[model samples]
Target: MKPHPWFFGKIPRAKAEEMLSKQRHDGAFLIRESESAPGDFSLSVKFGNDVQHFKVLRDGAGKYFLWVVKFNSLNELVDYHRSTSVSRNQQIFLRDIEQVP
Candidate 1:
């Protein structure tokens, strides 16, 4: 997806997990080619002390969505999820925009 470092082509789930585990951050993540679903992608996100695996699938309309959120392109989807913080379930998402006083 536009030469992103997060997009590691064809790495297996274990490799993805291992790589992300090395990163010293809570939100470290990567996108890899899904082993079980060829032509599809899997997102590995680090939370707490474990890396969570998630499916990135496209619907009949051919748009990308992790679960409920959809985007026209993967470029916008990644960091939007990264920078956008949340509560345990429901909370406000505070964004740091460019100076717009």
Candidate 2:
């Protein structure tokens, strides 16, 4: 439910890179579970021909926080990035909303 199309629970960086490559847009993005850190997640996005990966962490409140913001769930956090241009690493606007294949 939610924007699950944007969340891929267990994919690795390689696969994450591939999907965004297919999307091939400036800010196409998807979320995947972090292997080393079970509870945390990774945010893979296209910054250009190169892809950038960010992490979403869970705080004591059990809320999910990305580099600059927090949400009750990962999906809502990701979906918010879709409509806005907030690069905490600071300009790659998330102009692309990825859908599941």
Candidate 3:
């Protein structure tokens, strides 16, 4: 089967959780959910074949964003996102899309 790009926020939370749970169980993927200090939910999803994990965070200040943390042979991606003090606006280079997993 061919792989396709997947985007977050296009589906509702309830549905997304359900989908994540089902696929996670079947595929043996790891999924975790946590709450920020300010009372927002953050979800971390990691597929076994993927090189990185994805974080879905909804801040208490009504801001939400999804970002991926790439790895170079590491287990935990730094827990820097838990801090409410960091912000960045930089352009990322996407030279190729041929390798996603």
User: Candidate 3 lDDT, tens digit per residue, 1-101?
Assistant: 75322333234445445554444222222223333223333332323332223454444554455554333311122233323212244222111122225
Q: Between which residue pairs do clashes occur in model 2?
A: none
Q: If scored against the real structure, what TM-score would every candidate get? A: 0.77, 0.78, 0.25
**Clashing pairs in model 1, backbone N/Cα/C closer than 3 A:** none
> For candidate 2, lDDT tens digit of each residue in 1-101?
44445667899889888878878578878778888788678888887778788777788889887665778987678768777654655577665454546
**Inter-residue clash pairs, candidate 3:** none
User: 23-100, model 1: which lDDT tens digit per residue?
Assistant: 666666777888899999887776667777778778888889866777887667676776564233432232222222
Ranking by lDDT: 2, 1, 3
How many collisions per candidate? 0, 0, 0
Would you give me the overall lDDT of model 1? 0.69
Question: Per-residue lDDT for 7 in model 3?
Answer: 32
lDDT score of residue 69 within candidate 1: 71
| CA-lDDT, candidates in order | 0.69, 0.75, 0.33
Model 1 CA deviation exceeding 4 Å by range: 85-101
Error of 1 at 28 (Å): 0.6
